[PDB]
Write a protein that binds this ligand. Sequence first.
Ligand SMILES: Oc1noc2ccccc12
Ligand SMILES: Oc1noc2ccccc12
Lengths: 195, 195
Amino acid sequence: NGNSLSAAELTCGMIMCLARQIPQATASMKDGKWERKKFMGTELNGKTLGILGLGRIGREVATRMQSFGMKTIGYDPIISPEVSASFGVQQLPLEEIWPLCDFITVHTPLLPSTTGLLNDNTFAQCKKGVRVVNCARGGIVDEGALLRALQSGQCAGAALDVFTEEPPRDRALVDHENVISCPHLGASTKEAQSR
Amino acid sequence: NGNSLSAAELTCGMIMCLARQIPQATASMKDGKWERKKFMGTELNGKTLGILGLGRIGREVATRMQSFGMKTIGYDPIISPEVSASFGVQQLPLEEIWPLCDFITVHTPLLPSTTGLLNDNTFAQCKKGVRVVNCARGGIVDEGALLRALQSGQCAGAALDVFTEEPPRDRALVDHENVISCPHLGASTKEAQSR
Ligand SMILES: Oc1noc2ccccc12
Ligand SMILES: Oc1noc2ccccc12
């Protein structure tokens, strides 16, 4: 609400970080290395971003990423397709979303229907090399399934602000070379903090 | 041209990384830490972005950062104020730009007139806490002056894709906690590479 924009901005930051491996490149630089060929990335323009959860944060993410030329599609059980069209999000059923996306971002509450929304089944339906972002609630993305998808290359990268347990006690995700992370910083701006 | 969008996209990534310290937070997480107060950041909405160089890259940066609610102002001696108005950038003389900006990004060639465009004299005219990006040409930002500004806090952070010498032999900038960097990745996308 107040803090909608801080979350939406972090999410868009994470999308850009996944496309260009900025965190990993800075780490490489700080370790004294100049590794240009390693950190070959991708352009956002013309890519498809799937947005799962089309409330305020989802809508804000959409309109920012639309300025990058991304195609924004998505799904939300409550919001009508004509309403999401009005903010440039094409709604399709979930089963249709997975194979189209280059990037997926989640913006749902944590409910039975959204716990493990991304799981071994839904990762297998994605395009090989999909990049995922969770700046919403820990557990929306099944962490074990994510790890397996990163290990196989079915997922080329992931950005996590939130974890099933905080701080995460299992470190295998965090430590993966294709995972970027923050300690639940979505609301952590001076502005959000200070109404 | 071909590669305009890859440079512009990286620049926008770097601005979001400065606002939220994504690379430093990832490093902290990978070292097993959970440091929430350390990485309190700022919101981009409502802030002023100064764009120095209003050719194709500069214009693309402007229109993307406008979607975040940033006020975009700038300077370019060759681009008419009418042309820059067409993409929502108010041109002002340099002297008027420095004090207004929360963020500054450079998109000029390297010429006598732009070597040290940001230097001790122009840092001194900036708002305390300014954040700077150079994804254009190494030497636009004077490296010794940038280090002095980061040491005093006159500059709160900087993002560098390019250096006066590549790789930089002096590591004090790269090693600073408030500096984000990449090994000249601006054109390093699969797309740019493959027309
Ligand atoms: O409850 C939900 N809010 O947004 C969703 C998106 C996908 C599946 C379920 C939900
Ligand atoms: O000479 C210049 N080329 O582009 C510029 C932008 C700002 C200030 C000077 C110049």
